[PDB]
């Protein structure tokens, strides 16, 4: 018999002294929104940069240093597959993904001066972007790295 579960009556993020967010939501989408909000506040610059890369637009936004990854992702059809995977999500879960992205966009909109100038062009992000980054990380970084295919170690 586990202890009684907490039932939130309002949406709020309670941050502790180490910057750890305790996100309380009245429903699932609300929790994902708060989580996206929190992640943006804590790691926004890099998250936006990564989502930009997952779109296959690293070269477009930041130049030559991101071109190889752009070619790797576009050639493997990552951006388009992400759109398909996004469309193939169950209605409920897709709603959570949208909320997550919404939270990231909201934080950025509320605190524009805290988003690094170089990654502001990435906004707004979508649920599809979220799926794209996760797809890249899993299949095209962990499972199949560009290094192993290109024989560049």
């Amino acid at each position: 018999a586990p202890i009684a579960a907490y039932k939130p009556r309002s949406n709020e993020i309670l941050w502790d002294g180490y910057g750890v967010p305790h996100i309380y939501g009245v429903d699932a989408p609300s929790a994902f929104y708060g989580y996206g909000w929190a992640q943006a506040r804590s790691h926004g610059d890099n998250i936006l940069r990564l989502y930009g890369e997952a779109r296959g637009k690293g070269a477009e936004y930041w130049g030559p240093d991101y071109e190889q990854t752009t070619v790797w992702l576009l050639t493997n059809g990552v951006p388009e597959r992400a759109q398909q995977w996004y469309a193939q999500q169950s209605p409920d879960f897709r709603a959570n993904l949208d909320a997550f992205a919404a939270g990231i966009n909201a934080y950025a909109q509320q605190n524009p001066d805290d988003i690094s100038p170089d990654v502001r062009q990435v906004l707004p992000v979508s649920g599809a972007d979220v799926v794209a980054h996760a797809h890249r990380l899993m299949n095209f970084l962990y499972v199949a790295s560009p290094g192993r295919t290109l024989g560049e170690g």
């Binding site: 586990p2 202890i3 579960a5 939130p8 949406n11 709020e12 993020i13 309670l14 941050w15 180490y18 910057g19 750890v20 967010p21 305790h22 996100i23 309380y24 939501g25 009245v26 429903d27 699932a28 989408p29 609300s30 929790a31 929104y33 708060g34 996206g36 929190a38 992640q39 506040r41 804590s42 790691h43 610059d45 890099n46 998250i47 990564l50 989502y51 070269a59 477009e60 936004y61 130049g63 576009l74 050639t75 493997n76 398909q84 193939q88 999500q89 879960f93 993904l97 909320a99 909201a106 805290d114 990380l137 899993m138 299949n139 970084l141 499972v143 199949a144 295919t149 290109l150 560049e152």
Partner: protein, 521 residues
């Protein structure tokens, strides 16, 4: 990465114990971990995950928890193509490439962009690339038809029972990783997870290299279901573990052997000394308390030293060079632990770099080779003492070049520095036997080095009622410019002073320092 799950019968209080201990770069952005807690009326989850991911990979709650470690699941095949007549030779015939004409923009130094064409070609295998040496390679990645990876993790970490957990895991939407599970019911489980292609021939080494791209004989089309993969549930040993080692010693005694699975699923290479330590630390201890569990996680034994100094020291003392004799006596007096005050550890690492290679994984120098029959006590000994002493001679020079002396305190050179916080280091390279890992960088002009990879998110959980858990994040919970939460945990890490993880509302309200109300629709 390390992972431990202990059954009730092996603990003092009768509650399962779980260790989350991923090892990754301290700098690579997509590898940065973030700690968080989500609570709704229907679910609760606490844990860490890579930034950008909407679901927690290393999670736990009042009922269950999981952790992950890399298993290197070979879910992709690189094929060497034979180009001919505008296509590629396949089964004795010239096959045409499928191809679309794409284009992308490239940002210039001045801020403008230029348009660059990009032809995307694919053979029956998959997208085609050309290596610098001119090799034409087609990459075939499995599971490109599995869109539910994020929801699978979500359903796994919020499962109301082990059966529900397995049902979600069985969807096969998570393409890789070893996954360890534990719950308040007392169940523990280890799963060699991933989307593995079904092949009719060839061992793992074959499938990891360039495979012939001119034959349908090597074009797989199906993948293995969960039940075909190595798994262990509530073993007689009372624990499961994995420190990146092949899945052949996930518990002790073992419940299966390499012969029970296809030879292409996992390697049968020597288990690292860290992995050997993992098995010993669990199997050799009983009646575990959360406290003892946590103390064992800090283990930082120079196992490599135990395997080599017995032969090296005597041989070194034969050498007439007073410096070599001094080094040998220094190594002989060492307790073989990677402590901050160790004056012999740095020198030992330098000798080991030569004896076992830069990654410390070389096997050629040992007298007795690794054997699955003695999985935690081999390899052992120094095959060629005379050559090993010459290596020590060189190591002495290398130690002085890097650190300025052969007896510099380990923790004086090894430091963890974030922003303005500079604290002493302890523990070290996993391949030398250290369970707690800090992959120290090369030293700077002052002989100072810091972790480039290693302990990141570390947490130990006891599934009592209510659960009790402690943890730490090496590089803080934020990396945004100017944040006060980047270097605010490393000092505690240097003293192994873990934070009590707070899941209960009462605890959270007592520790809250900032509140962000919000609303969404």
């Amino acid at each position: 990465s390390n992972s431990w799950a202990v059954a009730p019968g092996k603990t003092a209080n009768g509650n399962a114990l779980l260790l989350q201990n991923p090892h990754l770069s301290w700098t690579t952005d997509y590898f940065t971990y973030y700690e968080a807690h989500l609570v709704t009326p229907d679910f609760e989850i606490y844990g860490a995950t890579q930034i950008g991911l909407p679901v927690i990979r290393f999670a736990f709650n009042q009922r269950m928890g999981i952790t992950n470690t890399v298993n290197g699941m070979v879910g992709a095949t690189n094929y060497r193509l034979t180009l001919q007549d505008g296509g590629y030779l396949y089964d004795g015939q010239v096959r045409p490439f499928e191809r679309p004409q794409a284009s992308y923009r490239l940002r210039q130094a001045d801020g403008t962009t230029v348009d660059k064409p990009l032809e995307i070609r694919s053979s029956v295998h998959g997208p085609v690339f050309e290596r610098a040496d001119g090799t034409a390679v087609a990459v075939r990645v499995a599971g490109l038809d599995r869109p539910g990876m994020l929801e699978q993790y979500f359903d796994m970490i919020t499962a109301d029972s082990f059966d529900d957990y397995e049902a979600a895991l069985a969807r096969m939407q998570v393409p890789t990783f070893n996954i360890v599970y534990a719950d308040r019911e007392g169940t523990i489980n280890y799963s060699f997870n991933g989307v593995a292609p079904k092949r009719a021939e060839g061992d793992i080494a074959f499938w990891q290299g360039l495979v012939p791209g001119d034959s349908s004989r090597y074009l797989w089309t199906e993948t293995h279901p969960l039940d075909d993969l190595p798994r262990v549930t509530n073993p007689p040993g009372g624990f499961v573990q994995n420190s990146n080692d092949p899945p052949w010693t996930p518990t002790w005694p073992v419940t299966y052997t390499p012969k029970d699975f296809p030879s292409y699923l996992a390697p049968q290479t020597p288990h690292s000394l860290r992995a050997q330590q993992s098995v010993r630390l669990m199997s050799e201890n009983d009646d575990l308390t959360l406290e003892r569990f946590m103390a064992l996680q800090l283990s930082h034994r120079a196992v490599m030293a135990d395997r080599t100094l017995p032969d090296l020291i005597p041989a070194a003392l034969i050498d007439p060079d007073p410096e070599v004799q001094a080094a040998a006596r220094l190594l002989a007096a060492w307790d073989r632990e990677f402590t901050s005050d160790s004056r012999a550890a740095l020198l030992f690492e330098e000798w080991a770099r030569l004896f076992a290679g830069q990654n410390f994984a070389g096997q050629a120098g040992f007298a007795t080779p690794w054997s699955l029959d003695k999985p935690v006590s081999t390899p052992y000994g120094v095959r060629d003492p005379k050559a090993a002493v010459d290596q020590l001679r060189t190591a002495i020079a290398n130690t002085k070049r890097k650190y300025g002396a052969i007896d510099r305190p380990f923790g004086d050179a090894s430091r963890m520095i974030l922003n303005d916080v500079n604290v002493p280091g302890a523990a070290g390279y996993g391949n030398l036997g250290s369970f707690r890992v800090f992959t120290w960088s090369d030293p700077d002009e002052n002989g100072v080095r810091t972790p480039v990879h290693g302990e990141t998110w570390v947490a130990m959980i006891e599934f009592s009622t209510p659960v009790r858990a402690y943890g730490l994040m090496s590089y803080g919970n934020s990396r945004q410019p100017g944040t006060t939460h980047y270097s605010d945990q490393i000092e505690r890490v240097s003293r192994a002073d873990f934070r009590e993880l707070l899941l209960r509302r009462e605890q959270v309200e007592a520790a809250v320092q900032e509140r962000t109300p919000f609303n969404f629709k």
